Amino acid sequence: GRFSRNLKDRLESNNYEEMELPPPTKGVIIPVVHTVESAPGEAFGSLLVIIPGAYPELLDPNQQVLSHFKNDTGCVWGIGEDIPFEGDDICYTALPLKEIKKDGNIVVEKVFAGPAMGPSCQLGLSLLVNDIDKGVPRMVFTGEIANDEETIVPICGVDIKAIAAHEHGLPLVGCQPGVDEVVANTSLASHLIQSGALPVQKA
């Protein structure tokens, strides 16, 4: 689709039961694209945050769907397709992220929609089970993961996702034109997480 602020306000007006939670042990932020049948050609993005633990009861019942990592190696609630690589034996919940407060608290909310579909979450999840140990990287990841499990693969809707990242004052991270910061593989992505941001040359 293409960005609709009209679509955004209507759908989001329908979000309910927003909650301020404690900072998760760790977590990872990724973008999603909303559409509806009766708004052809319109889209808007928002953010998920994926946290350790199974909290289906925090999701709208229409997202209470459980997907697994490859070979029974963990699960994610709120995601609608299985993950084609291994997890870290944990179960996560992907929650609609309204706000990430200055004290670290996250404000989530319930969203009238289906679970997150498609492959663009992979970069985030791969980084979450492999490369993140403490905290939530203050950046937004999008990208498919290749069969080598290191090469990042271009995805769809990058303009929409950038916009949703930016609404939160966060950079979009991926492998393709449209992203604010560019990583071709999970190594560089991981070095970026350690740095907390793109390394600077204030020279």
Ligand SMILES: [Mg+2]
């Ligand atoms: Mg294991």
